[PDB]
Amino acid sequence: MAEVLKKSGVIYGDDVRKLFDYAQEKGFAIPAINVTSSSTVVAALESARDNKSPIILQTSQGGAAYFAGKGVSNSDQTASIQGSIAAAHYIRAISPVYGIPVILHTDHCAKKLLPWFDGMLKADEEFFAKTGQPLFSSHMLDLSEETDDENIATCVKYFERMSKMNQWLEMEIGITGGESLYTQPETVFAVYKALAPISPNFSIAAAFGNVHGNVQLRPSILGEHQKYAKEQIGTDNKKPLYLVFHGGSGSSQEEFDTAIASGVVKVNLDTDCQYAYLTGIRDYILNKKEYLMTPVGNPDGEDKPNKKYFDPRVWVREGEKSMSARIAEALEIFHTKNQL
Amino acid sequence: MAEVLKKSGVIYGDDVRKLFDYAQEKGFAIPAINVTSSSTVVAALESARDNKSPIILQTSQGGAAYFAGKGVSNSDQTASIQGSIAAAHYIRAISPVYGIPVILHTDHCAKKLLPWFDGMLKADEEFFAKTGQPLFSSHMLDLSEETDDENIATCVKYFERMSKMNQWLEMEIGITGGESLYTQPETVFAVYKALAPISPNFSIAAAFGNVHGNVQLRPSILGEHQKYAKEQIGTDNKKPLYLVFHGGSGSSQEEFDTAIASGVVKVNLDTDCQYAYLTGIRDYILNKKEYLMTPVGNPDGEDKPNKKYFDPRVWVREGEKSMSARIAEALEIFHTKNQL
Ligand SMILES: [Zn+2]
Ligand SMILES: [Zn+2]
């Protein structure tokens, strides 16, 4: 199953489960990087290559709509649909040159955003019939606001449709129902019971104090999810569930270690990467002031041109470098560094 | 031939000549916008849609390499090759949602950059055998530094290869040879004589004072190119040649009008769009100072978060708006506005 470590580009099907299985066997998680442009995609691909690590690229509903541009009407999810498709084609085309396995993912999709999910699945199915692979490696459903029965049932419908393409499905379950502030292991296993007969290519993001009153992070309950599933399945697998860590910003190295030791394979990163991307472009035109105010600028008088300095290939690059540095911090924390 | 005006997305083959023929018949030129990212692509597509106008998107050797990221070694043109391919797939996927005809182009490619040209043609041929269309609508060769005989002969080889996919070829001719500061009409017609029997899908960018001593712009010689070709061809077509205007920044409205009246269909825009793209992002973090310096910021104390302000979907958008405004100025000048 270690054949995925030598794969180049976006992986699909059993290769996604092989990567997550290798993550569970070796005891590391992969950061899931929210991307909104070709520049943020490159920052993530470069960081994972320079650290010899796999990476997960994901577009949120707003991030995918940004790939299409805010000028596109998103009232019918059209911008999110067309933008995620366009982002998928870009990532599929450029990731092989970085020589790392890449999981192409989509982020939270609530019940109201299901037209976005339906549109992506439609493009996935058209691409699968042509090439034998879908566009995205995986999709995420966030029906945590709905009842646990309706959330799981709707997940069942889509997973039946996605399993035709061997597509991975991530689902989120909360504390809705149908302590009381954390998803109980019985509820998490109810997700496994409904999805496992369809396909093993699914992951679960449960509520365990990861706010995204003051509920503290309870990473120990993740190990309870695995022990409960293992006892109900009847196997020697200590980590039968693929768990996801949403909203991990601010957690200590100890909380991440216990979560990864409980079978967490994926840790979402968004806001922290957005700020890092800004600081590089922030530090550029700040320390290069009056070099960009006009096409006149400095060092001398009006005789000097500013084309060398306002070139977007120069200063947007500074945002990529600082974003890649922040992702490298996560690769070290999650032990993803130097796993390929 | 006016059927191209209702086309959505990237056009290929005879549709490119139909658009250029409609440009010559109606007397307008189309701006060629250099793009380096998904954000600059969106700025151009949105500007042309909002002005009901066709648009040309082009990647230079450096711009295509930027689509792959500076971290990718470009010593073998690999970054330029892989980046242009990835940019082509992104533009093909997202342009239909803007509802405008789009010409996908690549910019200057000198003799030393021919490995970049060969790599793109290879991907074009693989895509053409699969889908019946190449990736790019057109490519540009810049062998103006070579002798006119070697420039034209090398153009002949590639045009023979590109005509198999009905691909458009733009070539540049200068003052090399084999006044003396401007390309003579006989030299321009020598290009037509060698390329026309292969395919009519070619355009010529001649030297006429467009520096890119102090040679003044000589747009009148473009009308001399057309009259010389018409007399040698023996036809009633007053504009048998498709002409391109490189380095038009700083030209007056009168010089553009006389050039377009001489059959110019394409005016390159690069530096002016780079600066416009910066000013929006420049004006953002300038007028929003200390709102981005930390994840603490303002208006109040440390109690307030800055996530709403350093979100790249917010401030990079400001760069798209100012870039789209600059492109709209060119659409008005070149009379491309309100032609669809
Ligand atoms: Zn979540
Ligand atoms: Zn030129």
Query: DSSP per residue over B224-263, as a string?
Result: HHHHHHHHHHTSS-S--S-EEE-S-TT--HHHHHHHHTTT
Q: What is the dihedral of CA A337, A29, A339, A278, to 10 degrees?
A: -30
Count of Cβ atoms closer than 10 Å to residue B224 Cβ: 16
Closest-CA residue of A relative to B43 is A69
Instruction: Provide the angle, in degrees to the nearest 10, between the axes of the packed helices B114-131 and B148-163.
Output: 20
CA B134/CA A273 separation, integer angstroms: 36
Tell me the three state secondary structure of residue B57. strand
CA-CA-CA-CA torsion sign (B226, B231, B234, B238): positive
Name chain A contacts of B287, Cβ cutoff 8 Å: none
Among B169, B108, B181, smallest CA distance to B143 is for B108
Closest-CA residue of B relative to A64 is B313
CA A335/CA B14 separation, integer angstroms: 54
Q: How many CB pairs under 8 A join A and B?
A: 147
**A279 and A316 Cβ atoms separated by less than 8 Å:** no
| Contact check, Cβ <8 Å, A72/B278 | no
**B31 and B334 Cβ atoms separated by less than 8 Å:** yes
Among A116, A64, A26, A43, smallest CA distance to A337 is for A26
Distance from CA of A128 to the nearest CA of B (A): 15
CA B151/CA B281 separation, integer angstroms: 41
Q: In this complex, is the C-beta atom of A92 within 8 Å of any C-beta atom belonging to chain B? A: yes
Q: Which ligand is nearest to the CA of B247?
A: 2
Tell me the three state secondary structure of residue B288. coil
The span from the first CA to the last CA of chain A, in angstroms, equals 13
CA A317/CA A321 separation, integer angstroms: 6
CA A89/CA A172 separation, integer angstroms: 26
**B208 and B183 Cβ atoms separated by less than 8 Å:** yes
CA B103/CA B96 separation, integer angstroms: 12
Among B72, B87, B43, B312, smallest CA distance to A280 is for B312
Count of Cβ atoms closer than 10 Å to residue B189 Cβ: 22
The contacts of residue B67 (CB under 8 Å, 6+ apart) are: A38, A94, B36, B37, B59, B83, B84, B86, B87
**A223 and A272 Cβ atoms separated by less than 8 Å:** no
Distance from CA of A113 to the nearest CA of B (A): 19
Q: In DSSP terms, which residues pair with A106 in a beta bridge?
A: A59
CA B155/CA B167 separation, integer angstroms: 13
Q: HEC string of chain A?
A: CHHHHHCCEECCCHHHHHHHHHHHHHCCCEEEEECCCHHHHHHHHHHHHHCCCCEEEEECHHHHHHHHCCCCCCCCCHHHHHHHHHHHHHHHHHHHHHCCEEEEEECCCCHHHHHHHHHHHHHHHHHHHHHCCCCCCEEEECCCCCCHHHHHHHHHHHHHHHHCCCCEEEEEECCCCCCCCCCCHHHHHHHHHHHCCCCCCEEEEECCCCCCCCCCCCCHHHHHHHHHHHHHHCCCCCCCCCEEECCCCCCCHHHHHHHHCCCEEEEEECHHHHHHHHHHHHHHHHHCCCCCCCCCCCCCCCCCCCCCCCCHHHHHHHHHHHHHHHHHHHHHHCCCCCCC
- Out of A63, A307, A315, closest to residue B271 by CB: A307
CA B243/CA B102 separation, integer angstroms: 18
Closest-CA residue of A relative to B92 is A86
CA of A1 to the centre of ligand 1 (A): 29
Instruction: Report the run of H or E that residue B335 belongs to, with start and end.
Output: none
Name chain A contacts of B293, Cβ cutoff 8 Å: 282
CA of B193 to the centre of ligand 2 (A): 21
CB neighbour class for B261 (10 Å; exposed up to 12, middle 13-18, buried from 19): middle
Q: Which residue range(s) make up the domain with B295?
A: 1-340
Which amino acid is residue A262, in one-letter code?
S
Among A132, A145, A137, A213, smallest CA distance to A176 is for A145
CA atoms within 13 A on the CB side of B186: 4
Tokens of A318: 């500074």
Among A230, A300, A222, A313, smallest CA distance to A263 is for A222
The contacts of residue A327 (CB under 8 Å, 6+ apart) are: A31, A33, A43, A44, A47, A48, A55, A269, A273, A276
Among B324, B323, B192, B210, smallest CA distance to B256 is for B210
**A256 and A248 Cβ atoms separated by less than 8 Å:** yes
CA B282/CA A75 separation, integer angstroms: 30
CA of B32 to the centre of ligand 2 (A): 12
Number of domains into which chain A is organized: 1
CA B45/CA B320 separation, integer angstroms: 10
Count of Cβ atoms closer than 10 Å to residue A110 Cβ: 16
**B167 and B134 Cβ atoms separated by less than 8 Å:** yes
The contacts of residue B104 (CB under 8 Å, 6+ apart) are: B10, B57, B58, B88, B91, B92, B135, B136, B137, B138
CA-CA-CA-CA torsion sign (A76, A80, A81, A86): positive
CA B195/CA A301 separation, integer angstroms: 47
Closest-CA residue of B relative to A295 is B275
| Contact check, Cβ <8 Å, B93/A72 | no
In the sheet that holds A9-10, the strands lie side by side as: A9-10, A101-106, A55-59, A30-34, A264-269, A243-245, A202-206, A168-173, A138-141
**A56 and B67 Cβ atoms separated by less than 8 Å:** no
Which amino acid is residue A163, in one-letter code?
S
**A309 and A293 Cβ atoms separated by less than 8 Å:** no
**B285 and B315 Cβ atoms separated by less than 8 Å:** yes
CA of A15 to the centre of ligand 2 (A): 47
Tokens of B22: 């409609």
- Say which DSSP state B31 is in: E
**Catalytic pick from B14, B50, B76, B107?**
B107
CA A157/CA A145 separation, integer angstroms: 18
Instruction: Report the run of H or E that residue B296 belongs to, with start and end.
Output: none
Among A167, A227, A161, A239, smallest CA distance to A202 is for A167
Tokens of A47: 């960081």
CA B63/CA B273 separation, integer angstroms: 13
CA B80/CA B94 separation, integer angstroms: 21
Q: Which residue has the tokens 């205007």?
A: B245
Q: In DSSP terms, which residues pair with A141 in a beta bridge?
A: A171
| Contact check, Cβ <8 Å, A295/B275 | yes
Q: Report DSSP letters for B152-174, one per residue.
A: HHHHHHHHHHHHTTT-EEEEEE-
- Say which DSSP state B216 is in: P
Distance from CA of A95 to the nearest CA of B (A): 9
CA-CA-CA-CA torsion sign (B1, B133, A73, A119): positive
CB neighbour class for A298 (10 Å; exposed up to 12, middle 13-18, buried from 19): middle
For A321, list phi and psi in degrees, rounded to 5: -65, -40
Q: In this complex, is the C-beta atom of A116 within 8 Å of any C-beta atom belonging to chain B? A: no
Tokens of A251: 């957690």
**B72 and B79 Cβ atoms separated by less than 8 Å:** yes
Instruction: Provide the angle, in degrees to the nearest 10, between the axes of the packed helices B312-333 and B271-287.
Output: 140
CA B88/CA A40 separation, integer angstroms: 18
Q: In DSSP terms, which residues pair with A101 in a beta bridge?
A: A9
Q: Report DSSP letters for B89-140, one per residue.
A: HHHHHHGGGGTSEEEEEE----GGGHHHHHHHHHHHHHHHHHHSS-S-SEEE
CA B24/CA B190 separation, integer angstroms: 22
Tokens of A137: 């490696």
| Contact check, Cβ <8 Å, B93/A79 | no
CA B35/CA B88 separation, integer angstroms: 11
**B63 and B297 Cβ atoms separated by less than 8 Å:** no
Question: Which residues of A form the catalytic set?
Answer: 107
Strands A9-10 and A101-106, sheet pairing: parallel
Q: In this complex, is the C-beta atom of A287 within 8 Å of any C-beta atom belonging to chain B? A: no
Breaks, C-N > 2.5 A, in chain A lie after 178, 212
CA of A61 to the centre of ligand 1 (A): 13
Q: In DSSP terms, which residues pair with A269 in a beta bridge?
A: A33
Buried b (16+ CB within 10 A) or exposed e, A221-246: bbbbbbebbbeeeeeeeebbbbbbbb
- Say which DSSP state B265 is in: E
